[PDB]
Design a protein around this ligand. Structure first.
Ligand SMILES: C[C@H](/N=C/C(=O)O)C(=O)[C@H](O)COP(=O)(O)OP(=O)(O)OC[C@H]1O[C@@H](n2cnc3c(N)ncnc32)[C@H](O)[C@@H]1O
Ligand SMILES: C[C@H](/N=C/C(=O)O)C(=O)[C@H](O)COP(=O)(O)OP(=O)(O)OC[C@H]1O[C@@H](n2cnc3c(N)ncnc32)[C@H](O)[C@@H]1O
Ligand SMILES: C[C@H](/N=C/C(=O)O)C(=O)[C@H](O)COP(=O)(O)OP(=O)(O)OC[C@H]1O[C@@H](n2cnc3c(N)ncnc32)[C@H](O)[C@@H]1O
Ligand SMILES: C[C@H](/N=C/C(=O)O)C(=O)[C@H](O)COP(=O)(O)OP(=O)(O)OC[C@H]1O[C@@H](n2cnc3c(N)ncnc32)[C@H](O)[C@@H]1O
Ligand SMILES: C[C@H](/N=C/C(=O)O)C(=O)[C@H](O)COP(=O)(O)OP(=O)(O)OC[C@H]1O[C@@H](n2cnc3c(N)ncnc32)[C@H](O)[C@@H]1O
Ligand SMILES: C[C@H](/N=C/C(=O)O)C(=O)[C@H](O)COP(=O)(O)OP(=O)(O)OC[C@H]1O[C@@H](n2cnc3c(N)ncnc32)[C@H](O)[C@@H]1O
Lengths: 297, 303, 303, 297, 303, 297
């Protein structure tokens, strides 16, 4: 039997095992210094992705892989990212993805079972953990998990950033009050006005349809903007997956604002697809394409 | 600007995009058929790992990588696996691991920042997502997430002790969390080693349970408490104060075979609860390496 | 009618008013940079005070005023500090303090009504807001509010006892209140006195914990219970009935160094829970003066 | 080592320490007598301030300091006053105030760190505790904390007072029922009609935007009055802080009614500012100016 | 068709009806002034009755009717007094009382149906509303409803026992129910018998507590549990099974002075919890008569 | 010392005390037989009063005292009747009643403190317990407490009864489902049609403004009927108490339907009065007058 310590630990009872000694504050400072550096670096971001589910992570991979220089800030309200992609339907495991979504799986080197017009990843968790791993390895991506977007930063008749807090704080806003923080989009001067020498940053909202804060940016934009929440319709896989992919990308009516995933179905009043995931990944690819074109222009 | 569909979607507006058509029942049947196959195949398992946190997943990797033929059944009560390893401390990100835990990171190809006597993974999420990915790709590993162990399957006492494990009693976590409120029976996952009359077959290797359910949360230290509750010759030590030097050392050394019960193994913070050890707070080297230690003992059992 | 802007706002409708312009990220960075500096500076503290109620804040004032060079780290689980001192009894306002506690009020310049053997501050809120203001102005005091102590950092037993304190284990209170529900690790604040290998440096003064977490609420008497839970040579006395004469006397006298644990101090109603003393109800002289007593002992330790 | 008892306690073990003996009822009566005197005195008030957060307390200081003769009744639903000013953003400590808000800090002798166009108070708690201390020391200010305004006292087509209860009672109104009390504004006779020989009292509502009873008086006035709740818009510090300060003061459509703080943003549909506090203090100053002018006329 | 306003309202549409005018503050001051007078007058009481249920209210009537000069202070945690006597069993109405409890009904002029060995009040609500009405009319009785006893005021041990009662610790019930969640101090109500230095005045009759808090609900058997919790020479018997013959007999006989504590009395179902007696279910004769028995002993104390 | 047992119990230790022996089932049957007799008798009622608070009980007394022959069915959702009349305001005790409400107190022989234009009952609980006692003593009044009205029984374009359940069942309707019972008004045949030889029964709804089921019949009538819920306005004692008394009685738009108490303020959009109780009692008297006239015609 062989493992990473086979050459270092020679006693069967592991009596010769040891860690190098440590002081508790060394650990605290190592963590906190790095988190402040993140908060400082990403206080102005090029791309803010709200929601690290299948659509948001798929988009994050394509964006960051193509433009490793861009600061991609991912805000995820739950402790565990991945949203609704840890399971298939009814607590079962298998993740069905219709072709050509398998081309995304090949790119990420995610194995699957080919069934002709669709493929199956043997566990939804395998897809999402793989995408997470690959996204997180990229140099200018930051995952702020346990952190919720509570509002939008705006400028008079565009988005200009997001308003953030610890999720557990947001969930206690009903119950002394606790202010949020802010993450700003690229493109402004120290007087708060537009700097046209800079490319404007963008928000991609991929907060799904479900859960405590589902379809968050859609509701807030509708709350402020002429626009109404379409409302997700009944389940119809052929029409739902097609429309979600096609409708994903730039939002008409607000500048520098993008959507993907099931949030698009809520906003545009499209069908839903239930336990199949091709459109989540590919809507992320589509949104990412449009976002990458914005930064190339 | 290139991506996986660049060769087949040529319209800027994606108007030429399409999925192959589908019928809803095809998707349903594709999912359900597979889940039953899993339930049928793993109804008798060689290794049952309770809790897919850092220590459980680290152990799973070492076991399954070394013995890809063993049925390794991972039961995880939460929807998302990974337990307490998606964050560092106080909702911050960085994962500190003391050397020699960095050798495990090297094996898994997880990048880190070397600070001398310890290293830092830039996000805890990077560690746990990577281990998950590599574990789940193995051919005889199954993750039953959203599924809780709520009791042990046992056989009567022997010379080895009062408690003799033979499997776990399972349910959907959401069902378990409603038991206090018409009642809903559990399922069972059995360990290898028994005949069709329920008695031991000594020609067969007995399966094992590795419990790695941590110390915290709704079901923390589950198997430790159940074993103590069944056998009053044993007691819960109770996790003591934070002391990184002593806690990480002791958790690693004390992980593995549990003295009073046969075919029963522990790793991670559940060991600290059971043996009354110190805790270490936001450092993770002992979680990975206690899993490695338990895995070694389990592999030797099957050798 | 005059106010701070009378010289720069001349329009009755304030149409000539303006702020200097600002960028949102400037504000964010101004806040976050400072909080990290605090976390870095106080990661090793000289005095850790658990609970910013009347007794904790009174102690903090005496300690920091006498020794402004000491890092005095105040951990308070609630958003608003002040604990039980924003009101008198039954939601009424007046704060009764028996003499000689009025001498403390004089030092803090808190006005009161003299009734002979006792005095009355016209609102409890006036006492606690004033002490808070004066404490927070001191240069090496830090208030980490919305932050809970959920465990102790320890070192192995010595001749001084079973429990040896070396810091506190911390988290955002809202996280602590969710532990029963993916798990979230704590942070640590360490006491002065240890080297980079985690062992004691006898050339350095050991830091101290003063626990003043009261008797009531979600985390009442936290350190008393944790110390009792770790060392079974000690037990929780349990707060007895209301008896103002005996309760206030005993709480003041019993406050200070805890007999069984080194570098550990108590004041306020937590002392009553630990030593099994009477309670006093809506009178506050013993809270302030027990803080003074504990502060004296702590200053002597550092002298 | 020296403290307030160094000349009175001479034993190291404090064995010579003693309190003067007391009877429990002496303490009870001292508290209750004073609270009834308060209830009696302030049953008719000149200024009722609803909400003791940054804006309400800032206004209370300016009003009471300039007119120490006026009965200023502060109603605060929480046990601890101070509202949302015990923290900065995301549970961090520092309180950023843009100039000229620093002139308010100088007046209250609150130390700060000067950063050019803005200043920083090292802990939000230092600002709010200092203002509280200074406000509470004034002779005709009363803080009724743990007490909630549940409704308004009115007279046919003005405000004439507030309807009060213990907050914990208000929070149980959903669950035998429990009547409120009343606090009346100055200006009426014993038959309940207007006494024009008296100056009419005023309400200043500063109940914020957040929490269990946020924007209370705004919602209730809109409920009764032609007026609609504007609804707080997205975060934009330049426009939010400017407008909140400017819009604070007398409400158009109801006589003797004033607003300040974030309640103004909800009512008038303004932007929000997130974790900066200059407009809270200065909107209170502005409202206080208008209120003081009403009582001077 | 006649009613109280027939002589002053002559219009069929009541258009000539009117109230005398009023100012809102007149009403407020009328209420608050009176409540403070109550708090001031009863701050020292002769008899403190904890719980305004059937047994407490029955005792109150007998005590106050016989000695109208005594300050009888009734503390009731609920908004509505009457405890468990607004209904019979299983939400049905009828109140069964075994003879000789019917003699109490006769004294209170409560009509009943005579069934031989027992009688029936047609609605439990009729019994409890009538006793309430007659009790509240007495000149030195005060009902502090919506007010909970959450502790006892005590003095140090004597020859009479470990626990020596000197009053009760009070708060608004809604505050007490929030203690587990900034902390809120209680008030105090003191028993007659002490001087201004808090010590006993042997020239004065000591006041008494009668606890009648039942067995059930949020604060059931409060004083029994507190007395047991303070003095470990005593234990909670625990209410046993239902046995009407033995339960009603024993509750009546065992009610009155508590053996281990001076100036302390019990009646009703709290006695069953304390002494470990049977329960009786939906019959109420023992509640009324145990109150009578306790009242007799209390009156003899003051005689 | 003398009590009801002084001639029966002669031992100081009460050792000679005894109850006559009993069998547990004797007690059960005595209770249950009587409750079924009530359910049977009142299954058709002449007057159904919904809510046994100050207004409903005041009305019940006047109705039943004048017409002891009428079956008066009082439905009360709480275990304890009395609604909001066990306390004055802010958990204080005193009950202020403006004249001429004192004439009602004299009739019920409730002592009070005369203060000129108003009187004070020393405890609200004294008023409500006295009225309860006197109402419950009447021969054809039944109090079904712990019982909630969940809906109305109707006949096509009138009320014809109420739909009832145990309150604890009603409160679990959100969580296997549990059907209600019915209480019918007098006036119908066994085929369910109107019997014009009989006087139609009436509903008086006095369910207040507050609590879990406040203003129940007002909301349900508005739900079905042309009519809108006025909504209770601000506190103004002079106008509120006058209007509540005047507006109490027959509802225009539904036949055989009456209101009194604060439910009238919700329905007709009137002011509220806070902690004064004259209008509650007198609105009950007014409603009772109209109801008694209906049964006299
Ligand atoms: C195909 C399947 N079902 C279809 C059907 O049933 O018809 C399905 O719903 C998809 O898996 C959804 O994927 P998508 O990426 O659109 O959203 P979701 O997985 O919920 O991810 C959203 C993520 O967004 C997070 N989130 C949600 N709201 C917020 C917020 N305000 N701030 C930060 N993060 C937020 C949330 O925690 C989650 O991780
Ligand atoms: C080092 C750090 N902090 C130390 C300190 O603060 O002192 C720390 O606690 C570690 O991250 C814990 O790692 P470990 O693998 O021991 O447990 P955890 O991450 O809780 O994983 C346990 C997993 O086990 C799951 N689980 C818990 N109970 C059950 C059950 N009965 N059935 C199935 N799954 C269960 C649970 O959801 C979770 O995913
Ligand atoms: C005299 C009066 N009544 C006596 C009686 O009724 O008999 C009375 O109880 C005093 O006001 C209590 O003063 P003290 O300073 O002992 O405690 P408290 O005011 O509860 O302050 C404790 C503080 O400590 C905080 N706290 C409590 N637990 C924790 C924790 N684990 N970590 C951090 N902070 C904690 C808590 O939020 C609070 O602010
Ligand atoms: C600048 C910052 N954030 C801006 C942003 O996020 O965009 C911010 O929100 C300010 O700190 C708010 O200050 P403001 O004084 O407007 O309100 P707040 O601090 O909530 O104080 C309101 C006070 O009013 C109290 N309160 C609230 N409602 C009531 C009521 N009905 N009766 C009595 N008191 C009440 C409440 O407890 C609290 O103390
Ligand atoms: C005979 C019947 N059933 C017997 C059986 O089922 O076997 C039965 O239980 C009797 O009705 C009980 O009468 P009793 O007077 O003992 O108590 P109860 O009616 O609960 O009245 C207690 C009162 O006491 C109150 N209370 C209870 N605890 C407290 C407290 N700590 N402070 C103030 N008041 C308190 C409570 O609200 C209540 O009103
Ligand atoms: C004057 C004072 N305050 C004025 C102000 O604040 O402005 C005040 O509100 C009065 O005391 C109210 O008297 P009223 O008789 O109108 O109602 P209330 O005492 O709530 O009685 C209603 C009764 O009706 C009951 N109830 C309420 N809903 C139902 C239902 N659906 N079925 C049966 N019973 C019901 C409820 O339990 C209660 O006992």
């Amino acid at each position: 039997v062989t493992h990473c310590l086979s050459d270092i630990v020679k006693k069967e009872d592991w009596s010769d095992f040891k860690f190098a000694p440590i002081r508790e504050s060394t650990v605290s400072r190592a963590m906190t210094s790095r988190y402040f550096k993140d908060l400082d670096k990403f206080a102005v971001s090029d791309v803010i992705i709200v929601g690290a589910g299948s659509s948001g992570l798929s988009a994050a991979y394509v964006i960051a892989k193509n433009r490793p220089d861009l600061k991609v800030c991912i805000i995820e309200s739950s402790v565990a990212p991945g949203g609704g992609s840890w399971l298939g339907g009814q607590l079962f495991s298998a993740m069905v993805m219709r072709k050509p979504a398998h081309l995304f799986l090949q790119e990420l080197e995610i194995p699957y079972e080919d069934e002709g017009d669709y493929v199956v990843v043997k566990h939804a968790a395998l897809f999402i953990s793989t995408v997470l791993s690959k996204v997180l390895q990229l140099p200018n991506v930051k995952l702020f998990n346990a952190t919720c977007v509570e509002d939008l930063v705006t400028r008079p008749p565009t988005v200009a950033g997001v308003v953030t807090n610890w999720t557990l704080v947001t969930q206690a806003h009903g119950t002394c009050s606790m202010d949020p923080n802010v993450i700003e989009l690229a493109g402004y001067k120290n007087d708060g006005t537009r700097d046209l020498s800079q490319k404007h940053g963008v928000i991609l909202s991929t907060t799904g349809h479900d859960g405590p804060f589902g379809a968050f940016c859609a509701k807030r934009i509708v709350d402020i903007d002429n626009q109404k929440l379409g409302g997700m319709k009944g389940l119809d896989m052929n029409h739902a997956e097609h429309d979600v992919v096609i409708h994903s990308g730039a939002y008409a009516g607000v500048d520098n604002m993008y959507f993907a995933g099931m949030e698009v179905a809520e906003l545009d009043g499209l069908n839903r697809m239930g336990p199949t995931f091709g459109a989540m990944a590919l809507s992320g690819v589509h949104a990412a394409e449009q976002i990458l074109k914005h930064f190339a222009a």
